[PDB]
């Protein structure tokens, strides 16, 4: 009469919920690992404003024809 354990079904349900949270963490973990290895845009990784990688050099003796795309 003094033994009041939880029901077997409740134990299984609770452990299944815990394992589901654990698998969610495993998936988020693998996800972040993949996303860190993907490559970012030039604006996000180098410069948001002035997002053109192409330089323009010096402007004193600007020679017609020096521009090359």
């Amino acid at each position: 009469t003094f033994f009041h354990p939880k029901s077997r079904e409740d134990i299984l349900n609770e452990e299944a919920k815990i394992v589901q949270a654990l698998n969610n963490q495993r998936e988020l973990t693998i996800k972040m690992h993949e996303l860190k290895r993907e490559e970012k845009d030039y604006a996000h990784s180098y410069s948001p404003l002035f997002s053109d990688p192409v330089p323009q050099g010096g402007s004193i003796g600007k020679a017609p024809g020096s521009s090359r795309e």
Partner: peptide, 21 residues
């Protein structure tokens, strides 16, 4: 402008007012 800049780029969750005020 002599060079091309990003337009309305999102530094955050809110709209851009001025990149270099």
């Amino acid at each position: 402008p002599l060079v091309k800049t990003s337009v309305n780029y999102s530094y955050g969750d809110y709209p851009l007012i001025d990149a270099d005020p």
